[PDB]
Amino acid sequence: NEVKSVQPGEVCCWLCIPCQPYEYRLDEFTCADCGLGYWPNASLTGCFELPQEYIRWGDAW
Amino acid sequence: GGSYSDVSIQVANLLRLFQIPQISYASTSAKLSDKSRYDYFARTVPPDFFQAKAMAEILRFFNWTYVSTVASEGDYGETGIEAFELEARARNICVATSEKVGRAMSRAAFEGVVRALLQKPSARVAVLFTRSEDARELLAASQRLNASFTWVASDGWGALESVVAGSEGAAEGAITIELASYPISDFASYFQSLDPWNNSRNPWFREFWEQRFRCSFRRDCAAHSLRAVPFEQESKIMFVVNAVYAMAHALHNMHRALCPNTTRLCDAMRPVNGRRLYKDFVLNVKFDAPFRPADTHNEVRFDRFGDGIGRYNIFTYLRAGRYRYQKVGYWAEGLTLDTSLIPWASPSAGPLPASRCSEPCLQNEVKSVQPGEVCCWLCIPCQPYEYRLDEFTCADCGLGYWPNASLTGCFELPQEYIRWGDAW
Numbered sequence A: 001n002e003v004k005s006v007q008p009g010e011v012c013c014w015l016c017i018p019c020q021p022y023e024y025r026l027d028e029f030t031c032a033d034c035g036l037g038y039w040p041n042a043s044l045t046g047c048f049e050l051p052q053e054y055i056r057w058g059d060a061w
Numbered sequence B: 001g002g003s004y005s006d007v008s009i010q011v012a013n014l015l016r017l018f019q020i021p022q023i024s025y026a027s028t029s030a031k032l033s034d035k036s037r038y039d040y041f042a043r044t045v046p047p048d049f050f051q052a053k054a055m056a057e058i059l060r061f062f063n064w065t066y067v068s069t070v071a072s073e074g075d076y077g078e079t080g081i082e083a084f085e086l087e088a089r090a091r092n093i094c095v096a097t098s099e100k101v102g103r104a105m106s107r108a109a110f111e112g113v114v115r116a117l118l119q120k121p122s123a124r125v126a127v128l129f130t131r132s133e134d135a136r137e138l139l140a141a142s143q144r145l146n147a148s149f150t151w152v153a154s155d156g157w158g159a160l161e162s163v164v165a166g167s168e169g170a171a172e173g174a175i176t177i178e179l180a181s182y183p184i185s186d187f188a189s190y191f192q193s194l195d196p197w198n199n200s201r202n203p204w205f206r207e208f209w210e211q212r213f214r215c216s217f218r219r220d221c222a223a224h225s226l227r228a229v230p231f232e233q234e235s236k237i238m239f240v241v242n243a244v245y246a247m248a249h250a251l252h253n254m255h256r257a258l259c260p261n262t263t264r265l266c267d268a269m270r271p272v273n274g275r276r277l278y279k280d281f282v283l284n285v286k287f288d289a290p291f292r293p294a295d296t297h298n299e300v301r302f303d304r305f306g307d308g309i310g311r312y313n314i315f316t317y318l319r320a321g322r323y324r325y326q327k328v329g330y331w332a333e334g335l336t337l338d339t340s341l342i343p344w345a346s347p348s349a350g351p352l353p354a355s356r357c358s359e360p361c362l363q364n365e366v367k368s369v370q371p372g373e374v375c376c377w378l379c380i381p382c383q384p385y386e387y388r389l390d391e392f393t394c395a396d397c398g399l400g401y402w403p404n405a406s407l408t409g410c411f412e413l414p415q416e417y418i419r420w421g422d423a424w
Ligand SMILES: *[C@@H]1O[C@H](CO)[C@@H](O)[C@H](O)[C@H]1NC(C)=O
Pocket: B061, B062, B063, B352
């Protein structure tokens, strides 16, 4: 879930930066956000549509 | 003898076996100062230990902290670049890339060296510590590929017109270093009177005449003369004369010590020994430098390592529409230079050329460097409720507090209530 931002002057060394919960990691160095109503896949490379929620009969309310 | 440091070192290794003294006039490598190995060598020029200081201080003056270096393979270039890298670290200057030039390099190799410099576009300043031919070829390669750098060169480039012939566009604006010297006036009238018909003792003069005036003795060579064309004296004429006079004075003092009653050679001096002349007489000479201008006080002498004194002049290359070299300052235990003479350093020309790894951080951001990185950094923004305490610290403003516009202080938030005028 983290992305790499390389420090200039040292290829080996890098900075790990965590991504927001709703963003997904498209490439090694950057992560993009899924669209509204979509949530990042467990791979953090895609988007799975969010289920539509409503009140149900079996709820305690 | 000895103009290139490599030649001087190779010759010195052989001469120490037979105890023959040697005085150089243009070799400035630092390796020759080790008297455990070269125990019969002296020179009238300073070592390259001070040229690195002068170059590094020139870079510091202009705030150029990311730089690339190019060196020539051999003793001179390698030792000079090592000294410069040591001196540069001391001043928080970092080297983006390092290149080397071999003894046999083709044009494609020079173009590859030029392309390798362009990989790091942040470092726009190239530091050359190289021989003259390598500098000429590198300038030609840069002209071919339409590349632009700011050159800082050592005395190998010096102030030769041959290096920048036909590559004026690429060489414009460069800064070079030369040994401090003056021109002697008898040599000008001596040289300008020479012609191949009377200067028969020099076997190499006719070839030079043909190359210079573009003629062939086999005829049309007698129309030309060296007086009609202008004469530009080379920089290190003074040092050759000084070396010859130093050797003459050493022999004169030795003769005065060993043959007191005669002016002709005596039997004691017949093989002129050789360990004695260097250990006693060569290193103890002191006299007025000949043919010097009357105001000056230059003297000829050697220190414990048989070296000279370190003073340098600094030049820039500019366009007047002819091109010319212009002196802008000097270095003798400290840099002095006039920025009015440099064109790109003048006001109304524009911003100064820049060479740095990282642009400064913003007002609200903080620098983050891996431990021990003095040149490069990363900007990390502070939290909205935190104020920049110093470079690497974002300090929490406090509860009920907001950071100041300066982001270096805190002010209390106004309270809220249900005012008499609300819709509620
Ligand atoms: C170099 O930077 C220092 C500090 O900002 C500044 O005082 C000086 O004027 C600068 N020199 C040049 C020539 O840019």
